[PDB]
Design a protein around this ligand. Structure first.
Ligand SMILES: Nc1ncnc2c1ncn2[C@@H]1O[C@H](CO)[C@@H](O)[C@H]1O
Ligand SMILES: [Zn+2]
Ligand SMILES: [Zn+2]
Ligand SMILES: [Zn+2]
Length: 320
C-alpha cells in the first residue's frame, strides 16, 4: 500500500536503514520494477525520512501481495476499533498478555475479549489498561519473568514500568558496551538496560520507584551480576555517580534531565538519549546548545501517537 520508491542501486544500503529504524513493513514482498525497489513501509512523515536518507526517494501507494487474533477482532469489531476504545496492538510480558481497552465498555463484553484472547494467544494471564490494570482472562497474577536477548527479567506489570517492545533497543546497546565502560542507567526500571550492558565493568542502576529496585535486585541476582551492577534507589537527580555511558530510558521526560546526565558523564562519553517528536531537531538543538556534542547515531524507535515517534539519539559529549 505505502511503499518507498528508490533507485535499486541503494537497495540494500537503504533496506538496512529502514530496518534500523523499525520502519520496513514485513507484511509485503519488496518488489522490483525496472531500476526501482519498492519497500513496504510503515506510515511516515516525508520530512523525518529526509533526515535519515541521503538519497532521493518517494512515498507512493503501490499494490503489493502478502508475504492471529488481531484478525478476528479487527473484522468483528470495527465498530469500536474505529474510535479508540480498542487497539489492534497488545504487548506480551513473560506469559502475561496486556490489552489496550477503554473504561467505556461493559466488562461483560470487555472481559470476553480477554477470555477469547487467552485462546488465540499463548499466555497464562490477560489484563488491559505505569497505570492501573484489569484482570480479564487466564491466571490472576501480575508478577512474571520476561525473556529477551538471552537474559531474563522479573516483572510485576502492575507495580513497575516495563516495555517489551524495547528489547530491540537493548540488543543494539548490548553491542556497543565495551569492557572498560562505566554505565549510569538513569531510569533503570526492573533493569532491562543494566543487564543488556554486562560487558561493562561497572553499572549504576538508578530508579526512584522502590518496586523497580526490589525486582532489579532479583534480576541482578538471577543473571549473576552482583559484582557488576550497583543498584540505587532514589530520584536520579540527587545521585552523584560518574560514567562514560549514560542511558536515559524515559522518552516522555528525558529532556528535563539532560543537565543532570551531562553532569554525570565524562568528556568523551556517550549519552544514549530517548525522547519523543516528529523530527530530531528539537532534541538536537537542546543538546547542541547545552554542550559541544556530536551525534553518533540516530534511530526511530517506534510510533507513539499519529506521526509522533519515540526517537533515539546517541550523543558524544566532546567537551562539557
Ligand atoms: N526522577 C527519576 N529518578 C529515578 N527514576 C525515575 C525517575 N523518574 C522516573 N523514574 C523511573 O523510570 C522508570 C520507567 O522508565 C520507572 O521505574 C520510574 O520510577
Ligand atoms: Zn547507496
Ligand atoms: Zn468515548
Ligand atoms: Zn514489590
Amino acid at each position: 500500500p505505502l511503499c518507498l520508491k528508490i533507485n535499486k542501486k541503494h537497495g540494500e544500503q537503504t533496506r538496512r536503514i529502514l530496518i534500523e529504524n523499525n520502519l520496513l513493513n514485513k507484511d509485503y514482498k519488496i518488489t522490483s520494477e525496472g531500476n526501482y525497489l519498492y519497500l513496504p513501509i510503515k506510515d511516515v512523515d516525508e520530512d523525518i525520512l529526509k533526515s535519515i536518507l541521503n538519497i532521493e526517494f518517494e512515498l507512493v501507494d503501490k499494490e503489493l501481495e502478502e508475504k492471529s487474533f488481531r484478525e478476528i477482532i479487527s473484522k468483528k469489531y470495527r465498530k469500536e476499533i474505529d474510535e479508540g476504545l480498542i487497539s489492534l496492538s497488545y504487548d506480551v510480558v513473560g506469559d502475561l498478555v496486556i490489552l489496550q481497552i477503554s473504561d467505556e465498555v461493559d466488562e461483560k463484553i470487555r472481559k470476553e475479549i480477554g477470555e477469547l484472547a487467552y485462546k488465540l494467544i499463548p499466555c497464562k494471564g490477560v489484563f488491559r489498561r505505569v497505570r492501573e490494570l484489569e484482570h480479564l482472562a487466564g491466571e490472576n497474577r501480575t508478577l512474571t519473568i520476561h525473556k529477551e536477548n538471552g537474559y531474563r527479567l522479573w516483572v510485576d506489570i502492575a507495580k513497575v514500568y516495563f516495555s517489551p517492545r524495547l528489547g530491540g533497543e537493548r540488543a543494539r546497546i548490548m553491542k556497543k558496551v565495551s569492557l572498560n565502560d562505566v554505565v549510569v542507567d538513569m531510569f533503570a526500571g526492573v533493569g532491562p538496560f543494566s543487564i543488556a550492558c554486562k560487558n561493562a565493568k561497572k553499572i549504576y542502576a538508578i530508579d526512584i520507584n522502590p518496586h523497580a529496585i526490589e525486582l532489579l535486585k532479583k534480576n541482578i541476582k538471577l543473571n549473576k551480576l552482583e559484582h557488576k551492577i550497583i543498584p540505587i534507589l532514589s530520584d536520579v537527580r540527587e545521585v552523584d555517580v560518574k560514567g562514560n555511558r549514560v542511558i536515559m530510558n524515559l522518552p516522555k521526560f528525558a529532556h528535563k534531565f539532560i543537565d543532570k546526565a551531562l553532569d554525570i558523564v565524562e568528556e568523551g562519553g556517550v549519552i544514549h538519549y530517548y525522547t519523543i517528536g516528529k523530527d530530531f531537531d528539537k532534541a538536537i538543538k537542546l543538546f547542541e546548545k547545552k554542550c559541544d556534542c556530536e551525534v553518533l547515531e540516530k534511530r526511530i524507535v517506534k510510533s507513539y501517537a499519529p506521526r509522533e515517534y519515540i526517537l533515539a539519539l546517541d550523543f558524544k559529549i566532546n567537551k562539557k
